[PDB]
Amino acid sequence: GRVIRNQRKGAGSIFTSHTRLRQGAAKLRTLDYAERHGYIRGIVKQIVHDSGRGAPLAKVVFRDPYKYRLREEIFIANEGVHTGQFIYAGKKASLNVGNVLPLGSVPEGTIVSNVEEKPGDRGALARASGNYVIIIGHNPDENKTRVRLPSGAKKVISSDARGVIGVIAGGGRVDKPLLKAGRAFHKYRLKRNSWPKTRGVAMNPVDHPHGGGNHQHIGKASTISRGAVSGQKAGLIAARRTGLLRGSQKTQ
Amino acid sequence: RPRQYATVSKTHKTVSRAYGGSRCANCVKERIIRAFLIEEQKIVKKVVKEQTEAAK
Amino acid sequence: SINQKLALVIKSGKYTLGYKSTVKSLRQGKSKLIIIAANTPVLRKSELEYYAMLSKTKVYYFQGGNNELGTAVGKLFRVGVVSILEAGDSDILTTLA
Amino acid sequence: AREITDIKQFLELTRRADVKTATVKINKKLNKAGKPFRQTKFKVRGSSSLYTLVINDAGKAKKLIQSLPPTLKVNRL
Amino acid sequence: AKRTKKVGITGKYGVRYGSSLRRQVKKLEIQQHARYDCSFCGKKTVKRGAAGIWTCSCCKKTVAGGAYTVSTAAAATVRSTIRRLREMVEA
Amino acid sequence: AKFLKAGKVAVVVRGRYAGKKVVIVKPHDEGSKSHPFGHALVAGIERYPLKVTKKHGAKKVAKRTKIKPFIKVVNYNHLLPTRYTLDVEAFKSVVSTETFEQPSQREEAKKVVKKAFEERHQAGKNQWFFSKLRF
Amino acid sequence: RLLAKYRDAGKIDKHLYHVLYKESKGNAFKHKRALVEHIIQAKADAQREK
RNA sequence: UUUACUUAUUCAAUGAAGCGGAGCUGGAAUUCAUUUUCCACGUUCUAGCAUUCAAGGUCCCAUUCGGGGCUGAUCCGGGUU
RNA sequence: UAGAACUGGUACGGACAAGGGGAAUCUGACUGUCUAAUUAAAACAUAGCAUUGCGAUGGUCAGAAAGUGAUGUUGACGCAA
RNA sequence: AAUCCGGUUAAGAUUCCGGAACCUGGAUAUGGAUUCUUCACGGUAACGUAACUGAAUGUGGAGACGUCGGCGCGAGCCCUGGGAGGAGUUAUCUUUUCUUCUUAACAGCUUAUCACCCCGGAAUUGGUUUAUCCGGAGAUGGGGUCUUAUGGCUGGAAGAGG
């Protein structure tokens, strides 16, 4: 009867992001004329800790080409940049770690991150701690580029979309055990309101569709249709197979 | 405190050098030397273009 | 390689270590060679390049950091830049510098 | 507020024409450890702060009281 | 002396948490709280703070890197790939 | 083999005149009675002449071309020597050790040095020595 | 500070100072008189090696 | 058949800043008559600097201390991309 | 802080303050949380392990509707179930 | 952005009274300082001096900040000595037991770890912390510069309070 928890997340009263200590949106430079014809040199002032991100940020500063000032942007720091390194954005920018290039200017097999989906939207794909996409092919017909996303899924995007060279710092982050509940608590008090995770078997039949009964059991089948109404989707969603996986990696 | 600086003279708020009260001595030292040597080295960056592009 | 040469100089000739004594012995022109390490900051490196083209003294880059240079010259502390002022048994001033 | 140690500066203060009131104070304090002697303080009240002068020597102080301008209202002790 | 037979730093955790999880924490806290060589000034003075950020204590250099070590193994080869992919443009 | 000769341009990196160009008028590699270190007596400019254009009126030109000089003992560690040079023998005989204490003689020296730098800035030889080291 | 004023008093040189100092960072010396009795023995050994 | 469309519609970004076409100098390029084509078309050791409708060149004002015009910074089309 | 005598109707942390301990089994690893007015538990939570969906003209959800919104100052080492 | 002490009331005071300050805002005159080297000098330097043009615009700092552990230092309380006043005890003993001996904001001179400058050059490695860090990217050493939360002296101020 009662509105279950994942329905209740969406109106967003207490489930919003905890956005106090965050420095800002971590986007790249806006694609303009100084970028896509030459290459603009900025410096990286400071690589600063973001709160709730795994990866560290980077205070990059640029000269504005049109008015005398300095425009600071904040990149996601690629792994192996230090403060005082020069960062070369743009089409004809050379290929070093930390530079940001349009994908038509790299050979295939190059390890980039913070790359865009559509050109200009300032850094969509592969942003988290430690990940990277690898450019696996070019296509001069309609100037596309075939790349490898971190799930192992392959994607064909434009070569006008920019990406910064190298993996992202903060990698190896989930290797360490999170021994106690205090560390998960201090983790999730910087991200958002979804801890502790109360199992849906425990609760009554108003609170969850897995609830109730004289035993904690799941009842019916727990792989739920994609076509289920909002509110029934409680458990494994639209599962094509399940169970413990077997076999080698690097699939076909 | 940040509004007390107004009540006081200038010799308390400033040391005599260029970039005086804003940057410290050593840093100022570095941004002379760099600012010399780069804009001496850029002179060499024009004597290459007069010899490589002419004797190409 | 160059390490046998520098060891022979260091047990046969006269030298000085570190940046301030290179500039002191370079303003007086007593320098015959300076050897710059690889991990040195580029500003220090260019300021010692720029004093070479006033004093006409040859500059050999030491491939590898100041640790290896300190180990090569026989000391234990690191050294970023060496100034040979009198070569002794070895003739590194006239080899390929 | 302040202490002013220069006698001729104090004479300049007494003729600064904003100084309407002055006063003299007498104390007894002892030299090095031996002997008590009479000390005096001359206090002129300017429009912002109170300027004083400490005189330990009566042979200068007695001449200096004579050296005040007569138009000043001097609260003696 | 050596006051623990094997546990070392994870002796601050004591009894609890398992043994495999505590040894997996030991393996990463030795690397995490270590003192690394600085790539610029050569003094073994790079610690970390605020995971992903490795500041040299002197010299003010602030190198980004892996969360629990300076250069993770899956990144130190990446630059070699870059060292391979910058040579093909010229020679 | 000795590049701190008495004609070399140098750049003062320390002191109140930091970032301001001088020329050595007399070096001292051994030092002196006082100043127990390799110092050199130099003379340089404190205010740069401003960028006078085609369309400045004549009088408003001349207030641009005023130059405030200074003479100064400076240690060798505070000077970048450079490849540029300046002929010094006009005011070579003015700046000395005797030019100092009794500082009334310093303004007498600054008169001579200012007249020399204006007579070199007119007929504009040594363009780099009079341009602002923009740092 | 006893080692400090012994060094500054010239009664001992800096080599034996830096030996005895990092020995005093360990135990090796229960008290002040015990350290002076140790210094006397080492300096007498140095004299018997002279 | 889905192909080729921008003007409808939909998304995205920017204090709607350089888009499209053409030319110039270089240069790959081989000429099968003369250019049939295509690339470029101001910055890479350095935690410096970059602003006063821009200095210069050129034409004016009526020479005052100053101010205007063109070029420096290629034209064309007004579809911000 | 340690030791020594000597002495006290063998009393002496003299009042106050202030652990009962052991051999086992069932059970939940643990610190934690809850039925404020009968249930504090072996229940819930947790780290750990695993699974499923989804590459944004997306996945989960909200909104009567919107040129609307929450995750999202987000990007698969991520969000969600 | 800027305040304190002492006193006062049947009941109010960092608010009243007296004494002593400070800040903001706006007027302004007088000295001082600057100038015919027209917009300051000194010091190698770090920086200092009562002052010592400076717009549009840009940058930088302050406001700006986690909790825990010892370590140093000050403030207030505590313990305690000598001396100068009062009260109590006293059959005997007790140079005895209690109580007073204070000093504000603000101002002037001076004063500190850390940081920095010069001279000089280190392995017979050396300095140093309670806690092992630091040094040819130049230590130990000799001589200096700075911050002034703090302390001292003096003024406020003994004319107040006890």
Curated annotation (Swiss-Prot), chain D:
Gene Ontology, cellular component aspect: cytoplasm; cytosol; cytosolic large ribosomal subunit
Further comment found in the protein's record: Present with 50200 molecules/cell in log phase SD medium.
PANTHER family per record: 60S RIBOSOMAL PROTEIN L38, LARGE RIBOSOMAL SUBUNIT PROTEIN EL38
Keywords: Cytoplasm, Ribonucleoprotein, Ribosomal protein
GO-annotated molecular function: structural constituent of ribosome
Localization: Cytoplasm
Taxonomy of the source species: Eukaryota, Fungi, Dikarya, Ascomycota, Saccharomycotina
Coiled-coil residues: none
Domain of life: Eukaryota
Gene Ontology process terms (BP): cytoplasmic translation; protein-RNA complex assembly
Oligomer status and interactors: Component of the large ribosomal subunit (LSU). Mature yeast ribosomes consist of a small (40S) and a large (60S) subunit. The 40S small subunit contains 1 molecule of ribosomal RNA (18S rRNA) and 33 different proteins (encoded by 57 genes). The large 60S subunit contains 3 rRNA molecules (25S, 5.8S and 5S rRNA) and 46 different proteins (encoded by 81 genes).
Organism: Saccharomyces cerevisiae (strain ATCC 204508 / S288c)
Protein name per the record: Large ribosomal subunit protein eL38
InterPro entries, per database record: Ribosomal_eL38 (IPR002675), Ribosomal_eL38_sf (IPR038464)
Family to which this protein belongs: Belongs to the eukaryotic ribosomal protein eL38 family.
Disulfide bonds: none
Swiss-Prot record, chain E:
Compartment list: Cytoplasm
Keywords: Cytoplasm, Metal-binding, Phosphoprotein, Ribonucleoprotein, Ribosomal protein, Zinc, Zinc-finger
Modified residues (Phosphoserine): S39
UniProt GO MF annotations: structural constituent of ribosome; zinc ion binding
A Pfam family that the UniProt record links to this protein: Ribosomal_L37ae
Gene3D superfamilies: 2.20.25.30
Zinc finger (C4-type): 38-59
GO biological process terms on file: cytoplasmic translation
One annotated Gene Ontology cellular component of this protein: cytosolic large ribosomal subunit
InterPro entries reported for this sequence: Ribosomal_eL37/eL43, Ribosomal_eL43, Ribosomal_protein_eL43, Ribosomal_zn-bd
Purpose of the protein: Component of the ribosome, a large ribonucleoprotein complex responsible for the synthesis of proteins in the cell. The small ribosomal subunit (SSU) binds messenger RNAs (mRNAs) and translates the encoded message by selecting cognate aminoacyl-transfer RNA (tRNA) molecules. The large subunit (LSU) contains the ribosomal catalytic site termed the peptidyl transferase center (PTC), which catalyzes the formation of peptide bonds, thereby polymerizing the amino acids delivered by tRNAs into a polypeptide chain.
Assembly: Component of the large ribosomal subunit (LSU). Mature yeast ribosomes consist of a small (40S) and a large (60S) subunit. The 40S small subunit contains 1 molecule of ribosomal RNA (18S rRNA) and 33 different proteins (encoded by 57 genes). The large 60S subunit contains 3 rRNA molecules (25S, 5.8S and 5S rRNA) and 46 different proteins (encoded by 81 genes).
HAMAP family, per database record: Ribosomal_eL43 (MF_00327)
Swiss-Prot record, chain F:
Biological-process GO terms, alphabetical: cytoplasmic translation
One CC-aspect GO term: cytosol
Localization in the cell: Cytoplasm
Coiled coil, from the record: none
Source superkingdom: Eukaryota
Keywords from the named record: Cytoplasm, Ribonucleoprotein, Ribosomal protein
GO molecular function: structural constituent of ribosome
InterPro entries: Ribosomal_eL27 (IPR001141), Ribosomal_eL27_CS (IPR018262), Ribosomal_eL27_KOW (IPR041991), Ribosomal_eL27_sf (IPR038655), Translation_prot_SH3-like_sf (IPR008991)
Pfam families on file: Ribosomal_L27e (PF01777)
Subunit structure: Component of the large ribosomal subunit (LSU). Mature yeast ribosomes consist of a small (40S) and a large (60S) subunit. The 40S small subunit contains 1 molecule of ribosomal RNA (18S rRNA) and 33 different proteins (encoded by 57 genes). The large 60S subunit contains 3 rRNA molecules (25S, 5.8S and 5S rRNA) and 46 different proteins (encoded by 81 genes).
Protein purpose: Component of the ribosome, a large ribonucleoprotein complex responsible for the synthesis of proteins in the cell. The small ribosomal subunit (SSU) binds messenger RNAs (mRNAs) and translates the encoded message by selecting cognate aminoacyl-transfer RNA (tRNA) molecules. The large subunit (LSU) contains the ribosomal catalytic site termed the peptidyl transferase center (PTC), which catalyzes the formation of peptide bonds, thereby polymerizing the amino acids delivered by tRNAs into a polypeptide chain.
Family label: Belongs to the eukaryotic ribosomal protein eL27 family.
UniProtKB/Swiss-Prot annotation, chain G:
Residues in cross-link Glycyl lysine isopeptide (Lys-Gly) (interchain with G-Cter in ubiquitin): K43
Superkingdom: Eukaryota
Any one Gene Ontology BP term: cytoplasmic translation
Keywords: Cytoplasm, Isopeptide bond, Phosphoprotein, Ribonucleoprotein, Ribosomal protein, Ubl conjugation
Keyword check for Cytoplasm: yes
GO CC terms, sorted: cytosol; cytosolic large ribosomal subunit
Predominant cellular place of this UniProt entry's protein: cytoplasm
Signal peptide start-end: none
Coiled coil: none
Subcellular localization, as worded in the UniProt entry: Cytoplasm
Additional record remark: Present with 97700 molecules/cell in log phase SD medium.
Family, similarity comment: Belongs to the eukaryotic ribosomal protein eL19 family.
Subunit structure: Component of the large ribosomal subunit (LSU). Mature yeast ribosomes consist of a small (40S) and a large (60S) subunit. The 40S small subunit contains 1 molecule of ribosomal RNA (18S rRNA) and 33 different proteins (encoded by 57 genes). The large 60S subunit contains 3 rRNA molecules (25S, 5.8S and 5S rRNA) and 46 different proteins (encoded by 81 genes). eL19 lies in close proximity to the binding site for eukaryotic initiation factor eIF4G.
Protein name: Large ribosomal subunit protein eL19A
Organism for this UniProt entry: Saccharomyces cerevisiae (strain ATCC 204508 / S288c) (Baker's yeast)
Gene: RPL19A
